Amino acid sequence: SPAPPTIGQVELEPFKFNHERDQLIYGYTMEELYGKKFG
Amino acid sequence: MNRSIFQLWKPESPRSNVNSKQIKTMNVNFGPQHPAAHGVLRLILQLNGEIAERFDPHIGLLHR
Amino acid sequence: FQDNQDRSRVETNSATWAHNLPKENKFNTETLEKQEVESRILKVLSNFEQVNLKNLRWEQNFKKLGLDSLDQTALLASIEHEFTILFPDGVFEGFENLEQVVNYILKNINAV
Amino acid sequence: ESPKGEFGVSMLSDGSNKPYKCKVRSPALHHLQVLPKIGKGHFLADLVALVGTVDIVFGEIDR
Amino acid sequence: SRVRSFNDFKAAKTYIDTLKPKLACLYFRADWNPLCEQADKDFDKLSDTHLEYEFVKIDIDKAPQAKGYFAVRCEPEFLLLCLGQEMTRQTGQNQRNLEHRLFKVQEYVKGLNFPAGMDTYEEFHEQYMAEHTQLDKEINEWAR
Amino acid sequence: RRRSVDGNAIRQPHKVGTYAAEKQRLLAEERAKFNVDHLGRYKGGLPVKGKGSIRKGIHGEGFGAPSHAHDALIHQIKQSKDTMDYQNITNEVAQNFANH
Amino acid sequence: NNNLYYILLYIFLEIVFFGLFLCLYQLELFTGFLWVAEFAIVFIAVVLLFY
Amino acid sequence: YYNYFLKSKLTLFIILNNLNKSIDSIDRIFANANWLERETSEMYGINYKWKIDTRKLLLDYSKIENPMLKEFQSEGTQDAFYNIFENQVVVLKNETVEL
Amino acid sequence: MLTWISFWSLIFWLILIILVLKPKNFISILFMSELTWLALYCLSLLFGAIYCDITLLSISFFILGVAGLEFSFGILIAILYKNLNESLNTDLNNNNNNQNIFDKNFKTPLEKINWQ
Amino acid sequence: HHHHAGDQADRVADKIIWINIQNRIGQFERISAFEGESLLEALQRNKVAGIVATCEGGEDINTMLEKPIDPVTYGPFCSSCQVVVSNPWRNKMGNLHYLEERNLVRSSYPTTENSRLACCILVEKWMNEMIISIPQNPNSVYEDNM
Amino acid sequence: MNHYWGSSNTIPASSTQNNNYFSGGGNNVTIRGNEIMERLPSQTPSQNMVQASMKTLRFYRKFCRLIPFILRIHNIGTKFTAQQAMINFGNYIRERNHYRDPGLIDHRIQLGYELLYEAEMHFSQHTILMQYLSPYNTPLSDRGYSYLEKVKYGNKSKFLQGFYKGNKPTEF
Amino acid sequence: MGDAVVIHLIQNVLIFGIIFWLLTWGAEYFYTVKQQLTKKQFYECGFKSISELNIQINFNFFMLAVFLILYDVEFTFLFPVLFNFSMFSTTELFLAFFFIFLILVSLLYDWLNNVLSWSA
Amino acid sequence: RQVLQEHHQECVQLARIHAEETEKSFREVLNDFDRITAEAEYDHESLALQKMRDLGFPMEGEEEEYIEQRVFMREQLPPLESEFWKKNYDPYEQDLFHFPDSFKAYQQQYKRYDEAKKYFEENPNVEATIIDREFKEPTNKKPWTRKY
Numbered sequence A: 001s002p003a004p005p006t007i008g009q010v011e012l013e014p015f016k017f018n019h020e021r022d023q024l025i026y027g028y029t030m031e032e033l034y035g036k037k038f039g
Numbered sequence B: 001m002n003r004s005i006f007q008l009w010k011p012e013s014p015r016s017n018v019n020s021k022q023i024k025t026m027n028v029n030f031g032p033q034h035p036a037a038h039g040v041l042r043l044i045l046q047l048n049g050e051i052a053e054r055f056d057p058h059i060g061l062l063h064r
Numbered sequence C: 001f002q003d004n005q006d007r008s009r010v011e012t013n014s015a016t017w018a019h020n021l022p023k024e025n026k027f028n029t030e031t032l033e034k035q036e037v038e039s040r041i042l043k044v045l046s047n048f049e050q051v052n053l054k055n056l057r058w059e060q061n062f063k064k065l066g067l068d069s070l071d072q073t074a075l076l077a078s079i080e081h082e083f084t085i086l087f088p089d090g091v092f093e094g095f096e097n098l099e100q101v102v103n104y105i106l107k108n109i110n111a112v
Numbered sequence D: 001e002s003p004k005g006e007f008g009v010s011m012l013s014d015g016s017n018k019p020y021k022c023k024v025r026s027p028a029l030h031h032l033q034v035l036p037k038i039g040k041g042h043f044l045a046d047l048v049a050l051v052g053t054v055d056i057v058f059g060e061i062d063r
Numbered sequence E: 001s002r003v004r005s006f007n008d009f010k011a012a013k014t015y016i017d018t019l020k021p022k023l024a025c026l027y028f029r030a031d032w033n034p035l036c037e038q039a040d041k042d043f044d045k046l047s048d049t050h051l052e053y054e055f056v057k058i059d060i061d062k063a064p065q066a067k068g069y070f071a072v073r074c075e076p077e078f079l080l081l082c083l084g085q086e087m088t089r090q091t092g093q094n095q096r097n098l099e100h101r102l103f104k105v106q107e108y109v110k111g112l113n114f115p116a117g118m119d120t121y122e123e124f125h126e127q128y129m130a131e132h133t134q135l136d137k138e139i140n141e142w143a144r
Numbered sequence F: 001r002r003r004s005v006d007g008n009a010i011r012q013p014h015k016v017g018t019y020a021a022e023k024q025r026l027l028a029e030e031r032a033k034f035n036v037d038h039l040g041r042y043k044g045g046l047p048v049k050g051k052g053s054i055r056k057g058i059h060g061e062g063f064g065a066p067s068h069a070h071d072a073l074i075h076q077i078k079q080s081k082d083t084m085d086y087q088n089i090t091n092e093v094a095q096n097f098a099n100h
Numbered sequence G: 001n002n003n004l005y006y007i008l009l010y011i012f013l014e015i016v017f018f019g020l021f022l023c024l025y026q027l028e029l030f031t032g033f034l035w036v037a038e039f040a041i042v043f044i045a046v047v048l049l050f051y
Numbered sequence H: 001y002y003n004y005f006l007k008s009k010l011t012l013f014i015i016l017n018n019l020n021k022s023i024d025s026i027d028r029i030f031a032n033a034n035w036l037e038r039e040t041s042e043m044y045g046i047n048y049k050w051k052i053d054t055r056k057l058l059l060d061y062s063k064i065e066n067p068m069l070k071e072f073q074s075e076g077t078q079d080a081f082y083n084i085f086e087n088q089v090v091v092l093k094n095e096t097v098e099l
Numbered sequence I: 001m002l003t004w005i006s007f008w009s010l011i012f013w014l015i016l017i018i019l020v021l022k023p024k025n026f027i028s029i030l031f032m033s034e035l036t037w038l039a040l041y042c043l044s045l046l047f048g049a050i051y052c053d054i055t056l057l058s059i060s061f062f063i064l065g066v067a068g069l070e071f072s073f074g075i076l077i078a079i080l081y082k083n084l085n086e087s088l089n090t091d092l093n094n095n096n097n098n099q100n101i102f103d104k105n106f107k108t109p110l111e112k113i114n115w116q
Numbered sequence J: 001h002h003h004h005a006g007d008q009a010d011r012v013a014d015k016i017i018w019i020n021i022q023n024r025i026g027q028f029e030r031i032s033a034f035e036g037e038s039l040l041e042a043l044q045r046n047k048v049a050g051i052v053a054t055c056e057g058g059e060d061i062n063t064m065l066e067k068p069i070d071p072v073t074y075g076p077f078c079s080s081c082q083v084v085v086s087n088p089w090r091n092k093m094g095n096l097h098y099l100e101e102r103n104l105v106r107s108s109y110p111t112t113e114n115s116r117l118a119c120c121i122l123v124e125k126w127m128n129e130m131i132i133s134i135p136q137n138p139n140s141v142y143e144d145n146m
Numbered sequence K: 001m002n003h004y005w006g007s008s009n010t011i012p013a014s015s016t017q018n019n020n021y022f023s024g025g026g027n028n029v030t031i032r033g034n035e036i037m038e039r040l041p042s043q044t045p046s047q048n049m050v051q052a053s054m055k056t057l058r059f060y061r062k063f064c065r066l067i068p069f070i071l072r073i074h075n076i077g078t079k080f081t082a083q084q085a086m087i088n089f090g091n092y093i094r095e096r097n098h099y100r101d102p103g104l105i106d107h108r109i110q111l112g113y114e115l116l117y118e119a120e121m122h123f124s125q126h127t128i129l130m131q132y133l134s135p136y137n138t139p140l141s142d143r144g145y146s147y148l149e150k151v152k153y154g155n156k157s158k159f160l161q162g163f164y165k166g167n168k169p170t171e172f
Numbered sequence L: 001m002g003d004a005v006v007i008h009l010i011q012n013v014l015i016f017g018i019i020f021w022l023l024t025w026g027a028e029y030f031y032t033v034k035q036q037l038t039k040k041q042f043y044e045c046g047f048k049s050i051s052e053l054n055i056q057i058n059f060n061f062f063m064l065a066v067f068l069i070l071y072d073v074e075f076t077f078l079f080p081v082l083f084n085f086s087m088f089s090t091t092e093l094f095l096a097f098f099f100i101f102l103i104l105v106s107l108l109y110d111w112l113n114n115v116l117s118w119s120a
Numbered sequence M: 001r002q003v004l005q006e007h008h009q010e011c012v013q014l015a016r017i018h019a020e021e022t023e024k025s026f027r028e029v030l031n032d033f034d035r036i037t038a039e040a041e042y043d044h045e046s047l048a049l050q051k052m053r054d055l056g057f058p059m060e061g062e063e064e065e066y067i068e069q070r071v072f073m074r075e076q077l078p079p080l081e082s083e084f085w086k087k088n089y090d091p092y093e094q095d096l097f098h099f100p101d102s103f104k105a106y107q108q109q110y111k112r113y114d115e116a117k118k119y120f121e122e123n124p125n126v127e128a129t130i131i132d133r134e135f136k137e138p139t140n141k142k143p144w145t146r147k148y
């Protein structure tokens, strides 16, 4: 059987800090993934 | 701002004097006769510079 | 001339205010004397009035002396209070007689 | 839905005129139980504010 | 010397303060300890062989005030004093150790050179009261 | 006095049905969990990522460098995280009391 | 006196008497400045002693 | 228990017939179980093995009893009075009123 | 009874002597350092008044600034004693005996020296 | 050894001197040493804690481990390899060398009457099952923590 | 150890040192600790009456090591000496020596440890925690006692002593 | 700054305190105090305090205290130029502005390193 | 035989580790070299930062506003029932079997357990001990017969 995809322990967290977000959105942008945030 | 995590928390290592509580903790009780204790709570409160460190809430002073 | 047999220097000074009779050396490794330990333990035992101090046999077991399981624990704790020491669990549980207790206290340098 | 949370009563009746058991689940008990979890690391004034905000009545907690 | 026995605290204190011995050995005894009899015999035997010490025997049971004044914790107590202040103590009964500490105190006092006018007998509580006023009095004033 | 394959002298073991023998076997099992030899010393083994020179054995991973001293307090902390049935007075606790 | 609280109290009294001298010598402005600065210093020293 | 995903209520009943009333404690799984199990243990004498905190919750200091049992009377066994000879509160046998 | 010049020089050196005289507790030495700086402050004011020199009166605030900086550094160093397991009474940080201390008695951290 | 031609080698376990140690945390260790080595070398090989060993055995010529000790020796260069030996082997060791005693008394931490410097102790066959205690030794310079 | 009885839960000797400049240490065995007890985990269940008895002995040892401090802080050192309190609590335990359920003994040990902590931290009043230290057949050592019953009922049986006293008020 | 008249007024304040003392004693005539066990003990919300002399603080604001010392010194140094600012020149203006700039720079450095808050 | 089996298993796992190491690409090897040279100059503060980052701790001030949610608010994982049903729970101690008899006096007293087991096997059911509360004269008269 193929090896499972690697899942970090810092994942599965209800919320992410900036370093977690940077690891998660690698290759993309905050607006490219979450869309635009407005005030 | 910059990082201040080391100034925010203090862990305890085994037999480490620096990491231990190098101070007599102010183990005051938020006792019954206190305006903010509602009169029937004895909250044994371990403080470190008024920082609430440990809680031992004695309840049942109104247990009937 | 360098007298190598004179091992004295300012670091070896052992004059203290609390001792009118000066100590032999700076190291405070003075163990209590056997008669002092025996008299203090005799007082501690005199606190337990089911034991006769007149015919006390130091090699005799606590059970033969008249001490139950709790009395042995109480007696050893009282001895600890008297000498301001703590017995490690193995030593505390392995004490068979007052002679063993006295020997352990004699080998101790923190007893006061 | 009491104002302090889910106030529950568990009644076991044996058929008589008296309840065999009347257990009371008070929301204030569970609210006070989380106070050490949320109060740690806060100043004394913050702890007083936290005691105020959980809306705890000690008749429910002690009962 | 020889053993002077006292059943009263005030009489013993008056005798010791009037005599003003350069070297004194006080043997405090009580009836609770069964080893005081051998302590009595050892004190009597050591009294003759040491003429530089004044040997005084106090019974704690008949003189309970003596135990508090001399800070006796356990009996038999052998207190060796030079010029009124404590040089050493022996809390148990052992003739060899008692004679050894008598010899040590005798030798050390022999080796001393007190200044003129500062070699007078003092009461037993004088040094304790000096330390009390220098330390305990100030601590009490600060705390209570 | 004759010696075994190890440098320790040959002595008769405890009786089969003794609490001493039972506790000795249990202590051997406990030592196996921390990669600890019969003398109380961390041994070598497989390298561990992010733990420096600390190695891993078979039944567990060491808590120190190879050929080091196994700490009884560390073992108690790791095994029983917060459970103390009684205030056990060890040599360290007795010495701390004496120092105080 | 070895009690640090009494040592600090006597330091404070010394500051007061220095200011009294400077007032007697008719240097009162320097008295006021010395007093304010050293009273703040003694306040922080009392806090340090409490620590 | 209440399950939010299934919007359901569950009630698990565990039967105890051993005299010591010993049962494992889920205090290390559910954070609610600390004070709840302390109440259950102090009121019914349940021995919760492997429990985070075993201290009493609602009972008086220096008192060992299980009031929430059918054997235990409502009036209890002790009453707290003020003793002049002690200048403080003492505990004595209670002679309570009966209707 | 003494002239003010004599008194102020004398008591400046008296403060310097008392600082050494007292037991070497860091907080006490810090207090005596502040007192020494204040003595210098008063002496500078006295000499400025005598000789009509504004430069000597200038050292009044300069001495205050130097004393404040040194006091802040001393506060920080006293705080630092906690993390290095160092007694504030520096006489207790060494094993050398001295009769000045009633209670100084340091022993090795061991129970028994001889095993049978 | 006085081996003969064709004789097999001898077991290392039969040539091991056992040192029973009480570590500063009051813990019992049992380490192996070989005759001809120093106690400091044995302790450092066995990774025994509590021995700072700032000077690391002193000088390499005219050492304190030689028999007899050369009069022109400089002796120990610190007081960091201090071990409290038990009474029998301490008596068998004899009286201290004057330089070793000078370094022992010039120690910031308290010593004992059974205290010896580990690098001044030469392991011998009679030191088998030798009991020592190793309380924590002082750190002398800024580089003791480097 | 992250416990109230842990070796690191000791009140520092000074404000800048634990014990000395060369060693650490503290006293939490004979006095109270530096930090309050947040949690008191269950005694590990004992499968043997042997282990239950060992737990009882260790609890009694902990109590005995702590009784001088309790007497000092509660001002009851005149009512009984430390050894008298130890003997009275030993009598209390002897009245419970017939226990044979290891689980019940573990529960009793937990309750006793909690009560000891209560008396240690001034949670309970001295007039209420002294009932365990109070003597059984002898009076308290801080007040005068009456031997009228002993003299008037000289060598009479316990039955007669109860009979002359009565078990109910005589007016109703 | 005052004078011997200020000293005499301090004496008069002490005499006023003596008057208040007399009133308090006269009030003391009107009640009786009964000795009780805990009447003269410490109050800790109805239960005995577990500490008497060893009530230690943590003092997490020693950086704030030392900065208070330094900045009080700086403000004292700033006082003279502001008192006589009407006679300012290029030199005095430059020195005052540079000193205020140094104070601001020190404050900003204190802010950057998070030393103005509480520490654990 | 057990020694040989453990040797073989150790060699298998060591070969697995070597395969993990030797089969790295050139970029991974360069990253490892950079990591080693960085660890050659990392302070204890940097190592603590790395460990906290791996634990999910905040690394900015705005995130430090929510320190508790990661440092403290995350509950401890429950223990295992395997840990629950263990043989015994005595504190771990060094096996003082080859140590001298001087050291064995500090080890747990196993003879006490044997004696207690014998006693409880011989006494399964015992009668309740009743301490008599009938008034008795004090054994020491000191509180009522002392003058000073």
Ligand SMILES: *P([O])([O])(=O)O[C]C([C])([C])[C]([O])C(=O)[N][C][C]C(=O)[N][C][C]SC(=O)[C][C][C][C][C][C][C][C][C][C][C][C][C]
Pocket: C068, C069, C070, H064, K052, K053, K054, K056, K057, K070, K093, K094, K096, K097, K098, K099, K100, K105, K108, K109, K111, K112, K113, K115, K116, K119, K129, K130, K132, K133
């Ligand atoms: P020996 O050698 O005498 O046979 O050994 C006796 C035993 C084996 C230790 C033992 O006594 C025994 O026979 N059986 C085991 C113990 C047992 O069965 N029951 C003991 C019960 S433990 C107990 O009940 C303690 C609970 C405390 C109750 C309240 C007191 C707590 C503290 C209160 C006071 C503290 C401050 C004043």
Ligand code: FES
Pocket: J040, J053, J054, J055, J056, J057, J058, J076, J077, J078, J079, J080, J081, J103, J117, J118, J119, J120
């Ligand atoms: S290591 Fe330096 S004296 Fe031995």
